[PDB]
């Protein structure tokens, strides 16, 4: 019958700047993972990309409650026999703050072909300055 | 904690958020703190406060007063740590500023004064450490004593003035 | 540090002052010219580009005629880079001579090994043979390829393939005699590669 379905390019996609100082790692990522998805628009369509672009600054000041700065471990395997490598969350925040936030959000997005598309929509900067001033983003206040 | 301290003559105190500093004849010191204590400023009887009074506040109450007491008294009198040498052939020179110890090793060991702490060696069998930081002065003396701690049989090695060295009787 | 490029000429031996006899390697290092300097601002890393042998203008093409024209030199055949080297020296277009080294220096030699074709396990990886008698039929074979449980064969199960041709460096290799009229430099020991092969000489890293 008659139910509205969006089309690629029909919905205007905006740019947002989110400041991430003091916010918990998983509380920030959960809200960002639904901005990219498009779950805040009545034009939502499950099979079409209709979200927004998100820029995250101050990625080095993210929050890690409790003993997560030492007891949280990130694992990687190279598929060679006995090639398991690990890094704590505390030093990852110190050295590579951009990788910590990308790994968290990437697990919060659908694990399909369109879920990879939304990942390329995210830019994370460990400092306080971003290179995307030509796109004229706005300041988005987290709820 | 909750006690009071007295600013001596020549000592100045300024505050900036959780950061404080003290200038005195011996030198100057700087430190950070936790904002939740809200240091109480007075004419001279400086203290702090406990806005919450729970488990993690009574512990933090005492430390703030005690260390500021250390910081203030540090620039007025200074801190001293004394050491002695026991054992035949255990005897130390002084080559200018570097401290040299002959403690029976096949090689000598060298020591250098840190930033703001001074080592003097009055007698060949005694060593004195002085500085305007209790934390720094105490640490330096520990490193010197750690070369050869007092062995329990004949008392050989560096020691403090009041170490009740446990003594055994081998064989 | 310092570095030059050269061609492997061969091997011979010399007699030292003490009377001992040692083998040496002969290096031809003519026509080295500094071509380009790479800075942090321009590139992000510090390096110097060196060109080794001139070649006929027919073999050189248009794009590399203009690359060497900045340093005012004829087109070269080998071009490489050296890192962790001081940049106060090395003016553009300056010749680089063998006398930047001296007697009894310590260098590192980098080159491309000699080529062997399709080689089996006991020559490529130095494995063992099976018995050649007592009724066996296992002579020069790889071996068991792993346990049953994984349902697959792991990685780094060493197997035949093309053997040589990789880049190999040899460290802490001493220099015996240096000659500036012949542009000849003598290194005690062996360096990888066949005759006429490029050999990159650099000061020891350790």
């Amino acid at each position: 019958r008659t139910t509205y379905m969006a089309k690629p390019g029909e919905v205007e996609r905006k740019w947002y700047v989110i400041d991430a100082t003091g916010v918990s790692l998983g509380r920030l990522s959960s809200e960002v993972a639904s901005i990219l998805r498009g779950k805040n628009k009545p034009q939502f369509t499950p099979h079409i990309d209709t979200g927004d672009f998100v820029i995250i600054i101050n990625a080095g000041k993210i929050g890690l409650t409790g003993k997560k700065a030492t007891d949280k471990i990130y694992y990687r395997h190279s598929q060679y026999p006995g090639g398991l490598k690990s890094r704590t969350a505390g030093e990852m925040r110190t050295n590579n703050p951009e990788k910590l936030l990308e790994l968290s959000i990437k697990g919060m997005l659908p694990k399909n072909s369109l879920g990879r598309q939304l990942f390329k929509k995210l830019h994370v900067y460990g400092g306080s300055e971003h290179e995307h001033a030509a796109q004229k983003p706005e300041v988005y206040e987290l709820r | 904690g909750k006690k009071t301290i007295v600013i001596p003559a020549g000592v100045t105190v300024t505050l900036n958020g959780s950061t404080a500093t003290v200038k005195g004849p011996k030198g100057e010191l700087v430190k950070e703190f936790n904002p939740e204590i809200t240091i109480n400023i007075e004419g001279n009887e400086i203290n702090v406060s406990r806005p919450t009074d729970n488990k993690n506040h009574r512990a933090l109450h005492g430390t703030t007063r005690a260390i500021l007491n250390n910081m203030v008294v540090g620039v007025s009198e200074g801190y001293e740590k004394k050491l002695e040498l026991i054992g035949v052939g255990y005897r130390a020179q002084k080559q200018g500023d570097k401290l040299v110890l002959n403690v029976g090793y096949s090689h000598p060991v060298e020591f250098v004064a840190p930033k703001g702490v001074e080592i003097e060696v009055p007698a060949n069998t005694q060593v004195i450490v002085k500085g305007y930081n209790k934390e720094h002065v105490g640490e330096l003396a520990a490193n010197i004593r750690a070369v050869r701690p007092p062995e329990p049989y004949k008392g050989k090695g560096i020691r403090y003035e009041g170490e009740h060295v446990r003594r055994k009787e081998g064989k | 540090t310092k570095g030059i490029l050269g061609r492997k000429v061969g091997m011979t031996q010399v007699f030292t002052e003490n009377g001992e006899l040692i083998p040496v390697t002969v290096i031809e290092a003519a026509q080295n010219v500094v071509l380009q300097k790479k800075t942090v601002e321009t590139d992000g890393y510090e390096a110097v580009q060196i060109g080794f042998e001139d070649k006929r203008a027919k073999l050189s093409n248009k794009p590399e005629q203009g690359h060497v024209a900045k340093a005012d030199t004829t087109p070269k055949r080998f071009i490489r880079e050296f890192r962790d080297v001081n940049l106060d020296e090395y003016e553009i277009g300056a010749e680089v001579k063998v006398d930047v080294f001296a007697e009894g220096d310590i260098i590192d030699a980098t080159g491309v090994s000699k080529g062997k074709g399709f080689q089996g396990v006991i020559k490529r990886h130095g494995q063992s043979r099976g018995p050649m008698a007592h009724g066996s039929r296992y002579h020069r074979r790889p071996g068991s390829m792993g346990p049953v449980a994984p349902n697959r064969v792991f990685k780094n199960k060493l197997l035949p393939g093309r053997m040589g041709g990789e880049q190999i460096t040899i460290q802490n290799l001493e220099i015996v005699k240096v000659d500036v009229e012949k542009n000849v430099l003598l290194v005690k020991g062996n360096v990888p590669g066949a005759k006429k092969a490029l050999v990159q000489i650099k000061t020891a890293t350790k």
Partner: protein
């Protein structure tokens, strides 16, 4: 339809659970298919329905 009514209702300081309670408590019997249609095409009328939902919740 539920995910589209939710997204439109949040723009008016509401949520789906607390909006659909207001409508029942006020007597409106419009189903999800029609409610989502207004939220996308004629958002002007969706707000009029949402205002009545807020009145039912308060009184």
């Amino acid at each position: 339809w539920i995910a589209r009514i939710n997204a439109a209702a949040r723009m008016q300081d509401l949520s789906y659970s607390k909006l659909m309670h207001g409508l029942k408590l006020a007597g409106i019997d419009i189903n999800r298919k029609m409610l989502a249609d207004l939220a996308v095409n004629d958002i002007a009328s969706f707000n009029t329905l949402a205002d009545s939902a807020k009145k039912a919740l308060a009184k």
